[PDB]
Every structure is written in structure tokens, then in C-alpha cells.
Amino acid sequence: DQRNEEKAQREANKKIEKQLQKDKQVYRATHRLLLLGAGESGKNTIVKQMTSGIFETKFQVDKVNFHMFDVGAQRDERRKWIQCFNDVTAIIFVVASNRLQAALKLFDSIWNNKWLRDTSVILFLNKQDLLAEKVLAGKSKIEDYFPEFARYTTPEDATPEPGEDPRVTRAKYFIRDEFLRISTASGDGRHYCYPHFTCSVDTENIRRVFNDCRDIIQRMHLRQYELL
Amino acid sequence: KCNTATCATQRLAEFLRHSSNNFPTNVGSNTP
Amino acid sequence: PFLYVVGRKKMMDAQYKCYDRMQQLPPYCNRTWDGWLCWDDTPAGVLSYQFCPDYFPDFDPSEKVTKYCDEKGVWFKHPENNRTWSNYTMCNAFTPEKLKNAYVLYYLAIVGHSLSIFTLVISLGIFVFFRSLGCQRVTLHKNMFLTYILNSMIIIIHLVEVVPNGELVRRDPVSCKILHFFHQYMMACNYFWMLCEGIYLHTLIVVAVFTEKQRLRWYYLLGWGFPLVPTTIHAITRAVYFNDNCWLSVETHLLYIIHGPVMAALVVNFFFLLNIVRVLVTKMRETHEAESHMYLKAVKATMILVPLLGIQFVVFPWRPSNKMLGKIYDYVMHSLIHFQGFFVATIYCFCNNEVQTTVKRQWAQFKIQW
Amino acid sequence: SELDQLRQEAEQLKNQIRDARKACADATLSQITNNIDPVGRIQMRTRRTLRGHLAKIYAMHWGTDSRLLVSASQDGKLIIWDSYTTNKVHAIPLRSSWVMTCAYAPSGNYVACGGLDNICSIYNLKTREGNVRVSRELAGHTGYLSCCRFLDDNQIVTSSGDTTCALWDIETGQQTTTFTGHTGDVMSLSLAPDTRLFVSGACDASAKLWDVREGMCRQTFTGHESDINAICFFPNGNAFATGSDDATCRLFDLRADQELMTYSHDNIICGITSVSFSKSGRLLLAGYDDFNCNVWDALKADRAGVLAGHDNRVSCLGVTDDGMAVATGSWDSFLKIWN
Amino acid sequence: SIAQARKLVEQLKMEANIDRIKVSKAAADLMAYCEAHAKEDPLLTPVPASENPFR
Amino acid sequence: QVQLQESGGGLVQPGGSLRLSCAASGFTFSNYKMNWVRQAPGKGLEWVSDISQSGASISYTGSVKGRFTISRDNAKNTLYLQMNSLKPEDTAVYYCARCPAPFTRDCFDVTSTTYAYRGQGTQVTVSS
DSSP: OHHHHHHHHHHHHHHHHHHHHHHHHHHTTEEEEEEEEOTTSSHHHHHHTOOOSOEEEEEEETTEEEEEEEOTTSOSOOTTGGGGTTSOSEEEEEEEOOHHHHHHHHHHHHHTOTTSSSSEEEEEEEOHHHHHHHHHHOSSOSTTTOTTTTTOOOOTTOOOOSSSOHHHHHHHHHHHHHHHHHHHHSOOSSOOEEEEEOOSSOSOHHHHHHHHHHHHHHHHHHHHTTOO | OOOBGGGSHHHHHHHHHHHHTTOOOOOSSSOO | OHHHHHHHHHHHHHHHHHHHHHHHOOOOBOOBOOSSSOBOOBSSOOOEEEEOOOOSSSOOTTSEEEEOBSSSSSBOEETTTTEEOOBOGGGGOOOHHHHHHHHHHHHHHHHHHHHHHHHHHHHHHHHHHOSTTOOHHHHHHHHHHHHHHHHHHHHHHIIIIITTOHHHHHHOOHHHHHHHHHHHHHHHHHHHHHHHHHHHHHHHHTSSOSOOOOOSHHHHIIIIITTHHHHHHHHHHHHHHOOOGGGOOSSOGGGHHHHHHHHHHHHHHHHHHHHHHHHHHHHHHHTTOOHHHHHHHHHHHHHHHHHHHTTHHHHSOBOOSSHHHHHHHHHHHHHHHHTHHHHHHHHHHSSOHHHHHHHHHHHHHHHHHO | OOHHHHHHHHHHHHHHHHHHHHHHOOSOSTTTSTTSOOOOOOOOOEEEEEOOOOSOEEEEEEOTTSSEEEEEETTTEEEEEETTTTEEEEEEEOSOSOEEEEEEOTTSSEEEEEETTSEEEEEEOSOOSSOOOEEEEEEOOOSOEEEEEEEETTEEEEEESSSEEEEOOTTTTSOSEEEEOOSSOEEEEEEOTTSSEEEEEETTSEEEEEETTTOOEEEEEEOOSSOEEEEEEOTTSSEEEEEETTSOEEEEETTTSSEEEEEOOTTOOOOEEEEEEOSSSOEEEEEETTSSEEEEETTTOOEEEEEOOOSSOEEEEEEOTTOSOEEEEETTSOEEEEO | OOHHHHHHHHHHHHHHSSOOOOHHHHHHHHHHHHHHSGGGOTTTSOOOGGGOSOO | OOOOBOOOOOOBOTTOOOBOOEEOOSSOGGGSOEEEEEEOTTSOEEEEEEEOGGGOOEEEOTTTTTTOEEEEETTTTEEEEEOOSOOTTOOEEEEEEEOSSTTOSOOOOTTOSSOTTBOOOEEEOBOO
């Protein structure tokens, strides 16, 4: 009869709703991060620390669970599957250091994507030792590939590099300023960029990600209260 | 005394009830 | 006549205090005991000023009494009786001007409270109607609007039925005591609920930002259940010790039983606001934002949090003795207190971007259907 | 030194195709349907709203009985709702949190889901022993899954994001026929009513008609200016509609080899995310990125109405087989039924 | 390198030889199909509230 | 159908001037962004320059900055890259890339290995 079927359906729906609530209590307690970057950027070294299309890396810090997804295994074209990563708390970007211009254009395309305007990006300027060796050897040059280093002046606002020579600091902060100019050229106060100078053996990267996620969530909470 | 800002409406309410409908002292003559 | 009996007892109590102080203390007018307040012997003193005795409902502490010695004989003599008499004509304390100021203050409360409920029922109706806007913060907002309407509704009916009618107070029904008891609890619920969102805002912006989920079962108990304890203690203490007609009075110091934790709760809210402002200042520092525009944004953030946290009660805690300062305190403090519901509803419901955008979309949706 | 000859031959063949298409065209659809009564303003209201999803809904598929429907969202859950009573019959926690599509078997025994894992998972629902688990995990695609459709209880067609569509075979785990010829990621596919051909809209602004039995492209349709995000066969089976990112919907014909009509408005510029047809094939309910779906008169290319009830962009919509109602799913984790 | 061009050209020859009827006949057939099944479209022609399940 | 046909390109001495005009067809010109991409032999595809819709924002890569001058003729459906003072490092096959979506500035995937809307291209080489 209809009564028994209705009662069974209601019981099953109540059980399924209880399961949905239980799963929601743990879904909102985990932050999803998209690890993206150009090839040979050293992100695989961070991944290996802990074919398919998405690699899941579950790590936690300060009792907070983070869910980082590596997108290796997909094709080069990414204007379609990048729209799925719009609810992620942050988009980790790894840049190797014209290999830099491709990364700059990729970050530019990410920044003004209509579905990625809400999401903020964490910038990881990987391979600092390689940049220092390249700029110290003198075999190649950056002025020819960027006609702005000649007139560029070191930002006196921040240069906390005690053991680093002036030239390596100039190159590092020039790359950081090149990324930041694109980031802040068309921002609307809804998303921000977090540059970070990390090597290939830095164990602090997880702490950097944790702090940047904390700042992102704090700013979002401030925005929801209309304080900012 | 209740001079705190929290008990401000009650103080105004007490003044109206005690003044509009008097609870005069008549101090002018045969009074201290 | 309990207040009259209470006032009569203070007259003899002050007489004993005056006599005790005179006994201990070892062109000279003889000391004479005045009925309301004694005058110590003075060596030809003219215009000796002291504040009004205020032992009676008519008198008020603002005005002060005076007399002179040896200006005529040794003491001033009243022409009608040819006997010593002190001038209390300024201690009347009920003048056409003093009554006029209070009425413009009472009618301001009625207009403000009526407008506050008008802006809050629409604000509460919008939040419950729009399910998309629903959030953990919205549930606290709904409770603030619910406790704002209830507090304002009790206040307005108290000022149009109980206060104007003296016959109702004279009989002192047991029902009239219930109205004041609910007025105390509802007003304490409103003030204690301010601390609840003061904690929630501090527990979201500053501390434990990562953990979005937090149980609200302890917020409801603090908001509603907790204020019952100070209110039920006040009811017991007043009845056994100091019971007036309809329990409606402000003279007693027993009112701090319900006004003590409320002041402490709002003091904690002041500390939370400073931490949030410090965080907000730090947050915009890392963006390297211009300092000239930085100050204006910080000022706006503090001002919009003034009505939500009920922060004005601690910025101007006690009344001004001077008449001009007193008039300013009365016209400013009541304006913020009586219009607090209007300010809270306007800022958090009539100005929110998400609330506005949903309204515009739904209104456009309605116009297509019609 | 044959590159120039090959390019010249390709250009000559393209010119011949264009000339053949021009010869077969004598009167446009607009000048042949301007004698019928317009449908007029239409309006549907949300009869049911289905809630319970935590993340954005990317796909939904009605059952063949117009009673049950499945929905996939990015929180790793497959909820099988009951449209009539708004009851959740099933809730399958997927092992992948990035499911991009879902399907319902014609017999209702199985369901499918695929996403950013290049794996199509088949879940058995008809088994009743307290457990509902994945039966077969189809692997072999390189790009991400975009849309999967069931031909039978043992055959499923998948459209991956590596310019390849494949015809699978459950209970074996290996493919049967692989369709190649696209130059961009395949975003959607739709099976013919008679289950012998299927079109696929890729990111090359072109749609190809494939033969399931053989595995070779029959016709290629061009005319769109951007990536095709959705496709849907006409109920007659001799036509289909394409929803692209150039804010225009175009209706192609399988016999004339060329487009028939376009559905564009100057006041809206948004990519079409989903395209579906009514039971009679007169209305074209195509969702948009501006948070609502627009109903298009296929015969007259005039907008009959708009369904504005979604807070976020509609990512999937589908009319039931009997045409009783149309369900649209947006990115705000809300599933709505319109009648 | 060179195989993809040859495959594209051969597929073009396959697509060049298909039959293409006059577009007027296709439009007439589509219009006839739409008008023939118009009475069986609840979305197009409204169905009474008694005869729809979603009440 | 989108069909970007290029022009120009030949054996010229270093320091010369070349012009590459792209004949756009099959789509509305003044709705999309345009880019310039070159593929040097033995190397991957690289991005040369881009011009926004209606010629509002003009930007070049570091190597060619201050050298080339693009121009978008919306009416005539063409796009130029006025080369001047060429260098033996500019020998590459050049293509015009149509930008994937209209009225959008994200403009993804331009330098991908297989891009559907990219033009055929012409070989530009410099030697003596």
C-alpha cells in the first residue's frame, strides 16, 4: 500500500539526511587547495613529500585538515577544468626561475578569469638557488629578456636578505614585482596574491600555506561582516 | 542612585510618574 | 505610603548623623537644627551653599540650598513668621522647564521605539523569508532582532499604561509586579545578547578563525537562560528587603543586581572591539594601503559596530552634574539608546550587499511574473 | 614536398563542400516559418526545490520513468532524489571529489559518474543487501571525463577531454570502439533516439556525428565561433542544437549538413552551459551564465520566456521523457523542478 | 607530421560525397514534426493542475 | 568556420623590416582579443604580443618590447605586426591566435601545443 511505502521512504530519507549532516560536519572542516604551476617548477618535490588525473595529498597542521590536489595527468589545455576549482580556499602557484613569461601569462589568465575572481592565489617563487647561480655566473642575462631591469630600482620598503648579494635580491624582488603588478593592476579587493620566496628543500612551505589560508579566511570573515 | 546609562529609561519613567502625578513639599510657610 | 515611610525614616537617620557629627566637632550665629538639614554655627557666614537634601520625591540633587548669618541680626528671619527660616524655593525641583525637558525626552523615546520596531519587523521578516541569506551569523542576527522587538514592545507599553496611570500603581496588583519582572529580564536579555555576538565576532575575526563550526547551544543559554538568574535574584531581594508600589523605583542600590553583570558584559564587549580594530588595522597594513584612506576605513568600521555591540553605554557611563552637560547627555544618550534598533536594522539588513542583491534579483523576478 | 599539395587538396575539398552546401540552400528557416501563430509568453514556477547538496552541481540525469533523478556535485556525493516527494532514495559517497558528469541507466539498475580522474565508475543500485558499491571502474581515458551516456546495461559511451570519445563495455573493463577526429576537448554528447548515432560538441567550435556500429565520423558541422559547451538531439532525431560560448545557440540539421537557425539576443552576452529540448521539439530551454535559463522558440528564434530562479549559474538542465517538467541545477547546490 | 594532414584530407573526401537534400524540405519536415506533436507537450500547452504530478 | 590566414615572411638580411597580416574570417572581429605566437625551431611555442579589443591595451614580450607595432583594423578584418630591425634570434614560424572567448580578458590556452582557433602560419627566417 501507499502508507507502508511512504513510511519506508521517510525512514530512508531521514537516515540519508543524518548521514549527509554527518558528512557535512567534516566537509566544512577541510580546506581544498589546488597545486598548479608550469612544468619543472619543483612542485613534484613538494608532492612526493606527501596514471591518474588528480592526485590527493591529505596533510594537516594545527589540528586543521588540508586537501591539496595535484592535477598531473591532464592535457595542456586548461580553460575548461580550471573552472571546477572555484570553491578552493587558495590556488597554490609554483614558478620556476622565456619560461618566466609563460608563467606570468598563465597567472594573468588565472587572475581575471570570471569564475576565479573570488579565489585567491598563493605564489611560490621556487628555485631561488638556481636563479642566484644564473645571475652570478653571468652566462645569461635578464635585461635583454626584460627591458625594465636597467631602469629598475631596488624597493627600499622591504629587503630582509642578510647574506644575499644586492644583485640576487634585485632579481628576486623584480620577479616578485612583475607578478604583483599584474596581480594589483586590475584587482577589485575581492582576491589577493601572496608571494613567497621558497627553495626546493624548504620545510616551511606547509606553514606558509597554513598562514596564507588563515589570512584568506580571516579576510573573508571580515568581508562578510562588511568591516572591510 | 542608578546613574548608569543602562538605567536611563527607568529614571525618565520614574520622573514622569512622580511629577505629572505628584507623589508639593509646601516649604514656603510654616515649613523648614 | 512605603516611599513616604522610607523617606520619613531617613529624616531621623540624618538627624542622628548630624547630631553625632556636631557632638564630635568641638560675629557668630548660634547653631540651630533645621528640620530637613541642620546648619552648623558659622562666624558671620553669608551664602553658605550645600546641595538639596533630596529625602523626598519632590526634591532633586541638582539644586542646592543656601542661607546667611549675621547679615541681619545673627540669622535670617522670615518676614511672615519673624522666625528663623531657610530658603528652599529653588529646591522645588519641579518647574515648567524641568517638566518640559522630560516630556520632549519621553516623546522622543516613543517615536524612536515605534520606528525601531517598524524597521525591525521588516528586517526580521526579510531574513526568515530569504532562505539563501541564511547563515550561522544570521541566526544570531535573528535573535538580536527578536530581542530588540520584545524589549522595545515592553518599554513602549510601560510608558503609555503604567507610568501615566497612578491609580494602577496605588492598588499594587500582583500582575503589575510581573510586568516589571518581565521588563527587567527582557532588557537584560537584550544586553546579554549583545555580548553573545560580541563573542561571536571576536571568535571569528580574531581567534579560532579556521574553525567555522561552533555549537550555538551555549549561545542560547547565555543569551536567554543566563539573564534569568540575575532577574530572579533581584525579585527575591527586593520583596524581602525593599518592596515599593509595583516595584517601580530607581532610588534603591539593589538595582545593581540586574545592572551589575550587564555593565560587566558591555565592558568585555569594549575589549573585543579594540582587538577587532587592532586586527583590522593590521590587516590593511600588509596591503600597503594609503594611510590617509586607512584612517577613514577604520573609523567607518568602528562606527558601524557601535550599535551592534551596544558600545555607547560604556563611552558615556555616568550622568553630567553641570546643567548644560546634563542636557547634552540626556539628548544624545537617549537618541542612541532609543534608536539603537533602527541603527542595527539599517546597517545589517538595509545596507548588506548580499541582502540587497538578493532583494533586487527577487524583485526583478517578481516583476517578470507580474 | 607534399605539404603544399595536401593543403591545396584540403582547401579544394572545403570549397567543394561549401559550394554543395550553398546549392542545397534555397530558403532560410526564418522565411519559411513566418506563417504560424507565435507561442506567446510562457511562464513556469518552481514546483519543487531539492536541497541537500553541499557543493556546486555539475550534472543531473532524469530517470526513464520521470520519477527518480540523479545529481552529482563536487562534494563527492551522488544523490538519487524522488521528484514527486522530494525524498533522497540513495546517497552514494564517491571516492573522487571532482565528479564532472553523471548518468542514469535506461533500466535504472546502474548509475555512472566521471570527473577529473579519467575513470568512469558504475554503481549497482538494484542489489539490495544493505550495500551499494561500485561494480566496474572503467579506466583507459587520458583526459578528464565530461559526459557519459548509457546505450544498454552493458554498453556506455564516454566523452573524455582528450579529443576522444569511446564506446565502453561493462563486465569486461575494455573499450570496443574509439572515436577520433576532434581537435579540442569534448564537452558533451547526446545519443540518438534510435541509439545508432551520437553527436559530440568539442572546444573546436565543431560538432561531429559518429556511427556507433562502425566508429567513423559521418558529418562535421561548423558555424559556431567558440567552444561548444552543450548539445542535445532533436526529438525527431534528424537535428540537434548546440550551446556555445559565443552567446548564441544554433540548430543544425543532419540532412542539410548546414545550420538552420541561430538564437541570439543583443542584450545578453553569456555562454550557454546546457541545452535541452521539450517533448514536441518546439521550445529550446538553454541555460546561461547569467544565473537563469532562457526558453527559445526553435521555429521562430523568438524568446518565449525566461526561468529566473537560480542564485548561481545553471550548469545542467534536462527535460523528462514525458515532458511533464524540466529540472535545472545551478552552482548554488540547489536543484529545482520547473513545470 | 604528415599523417595527420592525410587523415584530415581523406576525412574531408568522406564528408564531401554525402547526400544533402534541399534545406526547404528539411525545414518543412521539422515544422511538420513540431506541429504534429504540439498537443503532447505539457511545457508548451499547459496541462491542468489535476493532470500533473508536481502539485 | 574560423580561418586565420597569414601573409608575409621570407629570406631577408638581419636588421630588416617585415609585415605579417592575418586575414580573419568566420567570426566577428571586434569581439575577441588577439595574440601573436612564434615557434622557434628546436624550441616550444612562445608568446610575442597581444592587443586587447578595439586596440585599447597593447603589450609586447620582453625581447620584442619597443620594436614591433601591432595594429587591428576591425573594419577590414586584418591584424598586422610591423617588424623592424630584425635579429637572427627572431627566425621562427609565426601564427595569429584567436582568443578563446568573446568579451573576456582571461584569454586562456593561447600558446598550447594544439589550439583549434590558431591560424596556419607563415615561416619567417633571417640570414644572408
